[PDB]
Structure 1
Amino acid sequence: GSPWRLLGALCLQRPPVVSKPLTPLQEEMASLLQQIEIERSLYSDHELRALDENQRLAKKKADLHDEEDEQDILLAQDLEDMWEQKFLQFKLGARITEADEKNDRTSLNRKLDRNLVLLVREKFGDQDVWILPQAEWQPGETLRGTAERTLATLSENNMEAKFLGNAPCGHYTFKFPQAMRTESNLGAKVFFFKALLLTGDFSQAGNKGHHVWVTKDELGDYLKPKYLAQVRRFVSDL
């Protein structure tokens, strides 16, 4: 054996649920692009229809020669009124949810436009530390297999995850305090593996206050300085 204890950590991420809001400059550029798109476009069918009906009203008022009584029951601008009415009745889903207002950091329904990371709390030598879920490597298993095993040893979940590749995306090696530091147990060598949360969540039984879903910005509050510096390298915030 070796002095270092091999570990496999899981970087399970919930990708954004909704699109990110446009920034002030993006809003102006989006307005100009829409303006340019209209200017360089041909008349649409709905525009040509609204034009003819305007002219028909003139031909049925000035010329007074119209030979068609029926014409069309509904006009173009009248049709737009029905469309706008239907839209106002429909109520969209909230992009800012109850969990956002209540700052419930244990739910997956918060910060829908951001990317969340799963942190669990473990006790190490009678000390409460926040870490990315991990498991100790066992013979006859790959280091990725350890990460997939970690997922299956969480507190009552039905989460389905998609692992991306076999290589680790980061590592963190620490040494135990000299009190327990030994030649055979010098320290540990964590190896993180990124995964995507397809579907699922901790059950109400499993929601008992031993995990959080946090963005990369609010990731330091829980992790330690040195552990944080190594996790903030492969956790993107694009």
Structure 2
Amino acid sequence: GSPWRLLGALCLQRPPVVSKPLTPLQEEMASLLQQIEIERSLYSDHELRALDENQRLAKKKADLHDEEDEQDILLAQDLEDMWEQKFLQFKLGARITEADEKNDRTSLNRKLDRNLVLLVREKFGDQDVWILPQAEWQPGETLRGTAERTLATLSENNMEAKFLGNAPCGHYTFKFPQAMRTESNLGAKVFFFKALLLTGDFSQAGNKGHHVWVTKDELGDYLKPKYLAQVRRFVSDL
């Protein structure tokens, strides 16, 4: 064996659920792009019918010719009015959920626009520390296979994660604080593997408050300073 204890951590990430709000400049560009597109486009079928309908209505007033006008039962603006009514009746889902107002950092539903990372609290040496879920490597297993195992060990979890590749995306090497330093057990070496949370969540008993789903900005409050520096390298916030 070797002095360093091989560990395998899992960086399980919930990708953004909804699109991100446009910034002020993006909104200005979006308006200009919409304006340019309208200017350079041809008349749509709806526009032509509205033009034709108005023209025929003037013809009916100025002249007595009718030409059946069966389609004139409904005008193109009358249709627009009906379309708007149905839209105002439908209520859209809330992009800002109750967990955003309650600040429940245990639920997936919060912060739909941003990416979230899983953090589980583990007790080492009679001390509580926040870390990414990890397991200890065992012979007859690939290093990624150890990360695949971390999910199974989680308390009452029903989640299907998609693992990206076999190589680790980071590493954190620490040494015990002189309490149990020994040549046999010098320290540990965690290797992180990224995954995507396809579907699922923790159960009520698993929602005991020993885990949080946190964005990269609010990731420092939990993770220790040295641990935070190595996790903030492969966790993007694009």
Per-residue deviation at 1:159? 0.5
Give the ranges of 4+ consecutive aligned residues of structure 1 lying more than 3 Å apart after TM superposition.
Answer: none
SS in 1 for 2:181: coil
Cα distance in 2 between the residues matched to 1:159 and 1:71: 55
Q: Give me the TM-score of the superposition, normalised by structure 2.
A: 0.99
The runs of 5 or more residues in structure 1 that have no matched partner are none
TM-aligned CA distance change 1:170 to 1:66, over 3 Å: same
Give the % identical residues.
100
Per-residue deviation at 1:63? 2.3
Per-residue deviation at 1:71? 4.4
Give CA-to-partner distance per residue, 1:140-183, whole Å, 9 cap, x none. Answer: 00000000001110010100000000000000000001121000
Cα distance in 2 between the residues matched to 1:105 and 1:2: 39
Cα distance in 2 between the residues matched to 1:134 and 1:69: 74
Per-residue deviation at 1:185? 0.4
Give CA-to-partner distance per residue, 1:178-214, whole Å, 9 cap, x none. Answer: 1210000000000000000000000011100100000
Aligned length: 238
Cα distance in 2 between the residues matched to 1:20 and 1:70: 47
Per-residue deviation at 1:72? 2.3
- Structural RMSD (CA): 0.8
Matched, 1:144 2:178: no
Cα distance in 2 between the residues matched to 1:206 and 1:188: 27
TM-aligned CA distance change 1:167 to 1:71, over 3 Å: closer
Cα distance in 2 between the residues matched to 1:230 and 1:53: 67
Give CA-to-partner distance per residue, 1:35-71, whole Å, 9 cap, x none. Answer: 0000000000000000001001110011233342544
Q: Give me the TM-score of the superposition, normalised by structure 1.
A: 0.99
TM-aligned CA distance change 1:218 to 1:66, over 3 Å: same
SS in 2 for 1:205: coil
Cα distance in 1 between the residues matched to 2:140 and 2:166: 16
